[PDB]
Amino acid sequence: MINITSSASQEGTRLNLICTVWHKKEEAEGFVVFLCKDRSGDCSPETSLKQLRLKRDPGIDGVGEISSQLMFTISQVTPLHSGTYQCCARSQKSGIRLQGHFFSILFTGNYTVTGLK
């Protein structure tokens, strides 16, 4: 395929939300990967928290060869970060859309991450 996966990592106070697209060499050209928060059906790169344009061959900003990764780093998790997140990718020209599983930050301060696996 070309497919998308979601993960997260935590270090000190920082929380990193990770969207990874797996793709054959060259297959990702024309794709954009983007992280959306609490968008009921208008998630796009323009309304995303962060995006990355993928490219035909490796570069030095998260575009790799058989996979590419977008990372969104939260310095410290506050109630502003509470809500539901989704990794997405699209190719405008192919009409391909890849959607990850919804996952949540729940701020209680202290927080949980749920819905990854």
Swiss-Prot record:
Intrachain disulfide bonds: 19-87, 36-43
Span of domain Ig-like V-type: 2-108
Subcellular location: Cell membrane
Positions annotated as glycosylated: 3, 110
Membrane topology: Lipid-anchor; GPI-anchor
Function: Receptor on immune cells capable to deliver stimulatory or inhibitory signals that regulate cell activation and differentiation. Exists as a GPI-anchored and as a transmembrane form, each likely initiating distinct signaling pathways via phosphoinositol 3-kinase in activated NK cells and via LCK and CD247/CD3 zeta chain in activated T cells. Receptor for both classical and non-classical MHC class I molecules. In the context of acute viral infection, recognizes HLA-C and triggers NK cell cytotoxic activity, likely playing a role in anti-viral innate immune response.
Name this polypeptide is given: CD160 antigen
Native organism: Homo sapiens
